[PDB]
Amino acid sequence: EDTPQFKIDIDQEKAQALGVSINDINTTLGAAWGGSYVNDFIDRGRVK
Amino acid sequence: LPAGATQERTQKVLNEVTHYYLTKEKNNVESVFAVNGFGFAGRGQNTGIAFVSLKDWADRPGEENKVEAITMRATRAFSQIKDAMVFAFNLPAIVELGTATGFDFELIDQAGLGHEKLTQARNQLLAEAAKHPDMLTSVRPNGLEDTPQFKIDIDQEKAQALGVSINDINTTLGAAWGGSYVNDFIDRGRVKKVYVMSEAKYRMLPDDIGDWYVRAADGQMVPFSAFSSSRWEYGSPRLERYNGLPSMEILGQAAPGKSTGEAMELMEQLASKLPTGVGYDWTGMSYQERLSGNQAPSLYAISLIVVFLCLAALYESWSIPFSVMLVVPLGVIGALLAATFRGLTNDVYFQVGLLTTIGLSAKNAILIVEFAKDLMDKEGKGLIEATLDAVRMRLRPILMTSLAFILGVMPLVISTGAGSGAQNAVGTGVMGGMVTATVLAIFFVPVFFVVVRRRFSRK
Amino acid sequence: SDLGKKLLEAARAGRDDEVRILMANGADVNAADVVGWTPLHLAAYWGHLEIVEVLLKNGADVNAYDTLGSTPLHLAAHFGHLEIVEVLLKNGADVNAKDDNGITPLHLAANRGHLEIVEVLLKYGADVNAQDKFGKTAFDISINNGNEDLAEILQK
Amino acid sequence: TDADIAQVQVQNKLQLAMPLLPQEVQQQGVSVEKSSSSFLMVVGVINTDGTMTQEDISDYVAANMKDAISRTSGVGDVQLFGSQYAMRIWMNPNELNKFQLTPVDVITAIKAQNAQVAAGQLGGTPPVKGQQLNASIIAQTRLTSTEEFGKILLKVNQDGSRVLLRDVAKIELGGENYDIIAEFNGQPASGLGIKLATGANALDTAAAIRAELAKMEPFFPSGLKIVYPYDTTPFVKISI
Amino acid sequence: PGADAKTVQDTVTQVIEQNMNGIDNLMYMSSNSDSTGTVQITLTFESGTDADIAQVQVQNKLQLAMPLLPQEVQQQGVSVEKSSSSFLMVVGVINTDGTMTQEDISDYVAANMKDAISRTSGVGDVQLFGSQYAMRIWMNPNEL
Amino acid sequence: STEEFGKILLKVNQDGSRVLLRDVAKIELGGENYDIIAEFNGQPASGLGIKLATGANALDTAAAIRAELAKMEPFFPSGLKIVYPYDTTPFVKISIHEVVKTLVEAIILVFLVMYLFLQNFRATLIPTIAVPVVLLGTFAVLAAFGFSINTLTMFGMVLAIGLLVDDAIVVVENVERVMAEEGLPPKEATRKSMGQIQGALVGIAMVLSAVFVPMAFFGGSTGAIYRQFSITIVSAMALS
Amino acid sequence: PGADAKTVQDTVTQVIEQNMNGIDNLMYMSSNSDSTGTVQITLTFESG
Ligand SMILES: CCCCCCCCCCCCO[C@@H]1O[C@H](CO)[C@@H](O[C@H]2O[C@H](CO)[C@@H](O)[C@H](O)[C@H]2O)[C@H](O)[C@H]1O
Ligand SMILES: CCCCCCCCCCCCO[C@@H]1O[C@H](CO)[C@@H](O[C@H]2O[C@H](CO)[C@@H](O)[C@H](O)[C@H]2O)[C@H](O)[C@H]1O
Ligand SMILES: CCCCCCCCCC(=O)OC[C@H](CO)OC(=O)CCCCCCCCC
Ligand SMILES: CCCCCCCCCC[N+](C)(C)[O-]
């Protein structure tokens, strides 16, 4: 069934006025709340 | 060549190798294809192969001018070369497969021990293998050893302090010293690659590192020496992995007189006394032999059972079949005598030769027993009368077949030309096998039939 | 030298028995590969205590430096071979030895966080205020790596 | 229908769509499996000494067991009941704002300072005449520990004080996801949900899995043990 | 290009190895990563396995793993070949008057010979011992 | 062209002068890598590694390759020459010739031995017809089963010569004996002669099948080699 | 996209065609390279 979800509108005019990139907003929101797979590292000789 | 040896040094050795083959073996060698920078064991500037092409076999009489002879002379002659392991060797019969003689061992890192710990565990197994020359021979790594490598550490703080980006630093280094594939261009209607790289003389020695400059945000040019530090460390120039886990391939063979199966049994026992988290497995020829070995006993059993069942139906007896099946050794002894005398091996050609020798000797026996039995059943003759009357009737056709076939395979034995190795294996085992199979059977077949018939008065 | 290149292999491999026979035959102890590593460099790197002692007994240069100015003490300290660091220092290893980068055995010991070796080096008079080409001390390394134990040891 | 040809035809069309998909979806890896809907068996893994958590057990299975089982013939799909470890950078917005930094600055720093660089060689080909030295150049390598990720330099202030990644985030080894958590009789556990490949014999595959698990058991850390909480193949074997 | 054994292993070899799942009749898998910037992963299959079905199943799992590899490796590309095959003959091409380098000869063979030999009746595969020309920019750091 | 790459603009200076790519780099057509240096008797060399196609004739292919290289001869620059350091087809041509020679010489020897004992040309012609019919039949069964003419299959028939030669001699010799001993006409003599050996010949076929057929049921590389001899000998023997 | 018939033939059609060697039961190969940047290489095989 459908559930409550948190709708957030990014005001384009306000962002352009303050000089805030939309890519920086989307990345900041996505990375913080959703998570971002940056790159790989080696944990005891295995790529992760 | 030794670890860290350059392309130029490897060429000097290949030139000496090439010079030798076109000087000392000019009557045998047609050409030398010198490939500097490639090796089946591993690649690098310190490896190379020389493919020697010979003149036609007609222009190389006697063993003196054969691969085995040239190989031995070449290997011995190149023993004098300093700071290089140079030796010649013949190609396997089937180049599709490897050498296919010995075992192929994989030492596995099962618990993320790392490269260094797996090297120590390998050296431990190699040392223990060396303590058994009576069982194991030429137990060596297939891969390469660790070499000195130039570790350079970029100071992140100094880079940010001078306003020099890390991408510009890592591109300047990678592009100059390593080379960078930029994009494609079209040369005479054919798409080809574009490569940027440093001109040789500016990417040779550690001192040249400081000759490379990177522009900062403020537009000032900063040398690599300003924000980098360098030291020497050891690392692998060729890292191996088996079934997803880090591995090291170990080659070896059973000592003279010992089977490969027994040589593997010890290698397993030695491997079980290695540090914790160090496993092993059998690959290639070894993997093939173990599965092929498990089937052999069951296939012999089935083969030997159906032979008996077929003869039992033919003769209408559980006893008489034995009279036929007892001829098997009469042919095999001759093949082994001929093989051991001429100095050949128990190879596929020899093995298939034994079966056809056994087959024809069995056929000769089947007809003698059939004739002998039919005289006893139909014409009511006695055992000895029927046996003597049988061998009498079957003498001529056996001698005709034997005389024709022995002369027929004579050229294969004496052959010393192209593909003579296969012909010799086919001819030698069959000729010797047929000589004994013919001479013994005519006297031994009637003995087998009489003894078996006397023993079992059941039918 | 022929035997010189067999000694380099022997010292690296940790083949105590072969090194023994080489010292008797008179294998060059000052033999160096292309990068300038003596058998003592290799022995110190791979952590072969017995071979380090044997080479030092047979007149091996304890303060021998590679083409980048690094000594066996640098390697022994960096790779955490405590026994070899003590043996080298007793045979007169330069404790304040600077490579081409201005890095010392203390810097390298501090970076990998070898507490025993740091104290052994400090006991033999390691300059704690010794700065590299970036003006960094062993203390500056300890706080950056976040090693509280090492930071407490390095209070001059 | 031949499942081999079905997979090839489906993937042939998937590869036309792949480039149009978001970069985040491609980097997560799209998979094309030919398996049954139901599980063949569940291979449970527990620590009887209790010296490994649900998260430790899940990482070990993912790192030392899953891949070899996934490559076994007859295994169509393998579901890890748990997650493999990842380097988790848990960002603090109060600390990020304090130093005038954002997640963008953190992502840029990690890519720059957790890099595996191809730096070339000394005396590389083509070389100059009279070159005696040939050695690989080693620059930045992948970071191996939380400590190394901790000392990633984000920026340096006006006074010359350093801002490290550990100043704006807590850094630990943690699962790729935290969705799946398994138990065996109320005890911390992980395991592998194995689906039978289309057409493959269930008993032959089950035997092949047991043979592969037997090659792992010897090299287990102390306490770790394999349990069989779900298997459909024993019924087939016993019923016949 | 310009990558060490460890760089090749930790960015390419391990990433490909981890994605070699759901492939039918695999006996074992081996690989090596060398200092010339090369990796070779050999997947050996059961006897009586269709080599075409085996190659495409390997190929298909690699294609989906291509986005996980470095930009420089995707740009160069990753070859999937049947390696168990052997050579019928080796045609050598030489320059006697010393007017051409091995690069010059290789480019001619690639441009004017290889394709025609590939279309010849009964030829199953043709491999060039060398590379066609590439535009080489040999940079000078003093002038830069 | 190298000219165009040389004319690539990098920077325009304050005085107005232009920095091109040829001002900061040497530009030429070279190789993709310089790792391998190939020489043939000290002379710069390249080459082509040619593999045989599935179901193709090695001797026809090599002839077709030489024919195609002959058409390219006129367009080669001055100094360029073709050389054949490795070629397997001269070895295969000798293998076929030597095996056909062996089978021909075998039939000639049977003819001589048949005449030495039986002493009539009419009898010596029966093996001369029978053996080639069996050998030709073997190739038909060989082709039907999807096998090729190779070293293993060719020497397989050489190893079977004895079994084929014997079937011919045994049948004719037994008739010649019955006629000489009982004075029966050729037709009535054959009826009786075959009546004495027909049961054995059928039995011999089954015994030799039991010896050779199981050899084809070995697995792996060894199994594949053994299966070449097994199928060839069993086919040749069955037709005989 | 955007490539002429000549450009796409040199960079695509000829690159694919030169790799279409040693395929079983291949009768003939036809291809066309047009001004829309579209390439189509048709391989016809033996009956059966
Ligand atoms: C018309 C007359 C000619 C007929 C001759 C041909 C008969 C058919 C041959 C079938 C081949 C059988 O193939 C063989 O089967 C047996 C099953 O018992 C397998 O099984 C084998 O495995 C292991 C070996 O240690 C044992 O547990 C088992 O006793 C053994 O039989 C072999 O691994 C397989 O190679
Ligand atoms: C005993 C009665 C039954 C006869 C059995 C004969 C044994 C079977 C071998 C048949 C060989 C079949 O293949 C046959 O071989 C001959 C050479 O021998 C080849 O002939 C070849 O000759 C030369 C070789 O340098 C080339 O110029 C030519 O282009 C090529 O075709 C043919 O490709 C083919 O016609
Ligand atoms: C149906 C039976 C025919 C079998 C044909 C040959 C089988 C191949 C076996 C083989 O050679 O492999 C074993 C290995 C090869 O490296 O060593 C051998 O060659 C050993 C062979 C032992 C033979 C014992 C005879 C038993 C009498 C009942
Ligand atoms: C599998 C059984 C094979 C045995 C062969 C039997 C053949 C002998 C037949 C005898 N006969 C019917 C001709 O009198």
Author numbering:
A (entry chain A): 722 to 769
B (entry chain B): 578 to 1036
C (entry chain D): 12 to 167
D (entry chain A): 98 to 337
E (entry chain B): 50 to 193
F (entry chain B): 242 to 481
G (entry chain C): 50 to 97
What does the paper say about this structure?
Efflux transporters of the RND family confer resistance to multiple antibiotics in Gram-negative bacteria.
Here, the TM helices show subtle differences in their conformation at the cytoplasmic side, leading to an expansion of the narrow channel between the D407, D408, and K940 residues of the proton relay site and the cytoplasm, thus allowing for the accommodation of BDM88855 (9). The quinoline moiety of the inhibitor interacts with surrounding hydrophobic residues, including V411, L442, I445, and F948. The piperazine moiety is mainly surrounded by residues involved in the proton relay network (D407, D408, and K940), as well as L449, and the carbonyl oxygen of the main chain L404. Furthermore, the D407 and K940 side chains are re-orientated to accommodate the piperazine moiety of BDM88855 (9), (normally, K940 occupies this area in the unliganded L protomer). This re-orientation disrupts the H-bond network between S481, D407, D408, K940, and T97813, while maintaining H-bonding between S481 and D408 in the BDM88855 (9) co-structure. The presence of a halogen atom in position 3 of the quinoline ring is required for inhibitor activity and correlates with the formation of a halogen bond to the main chain carbonyl oxygen of K940.
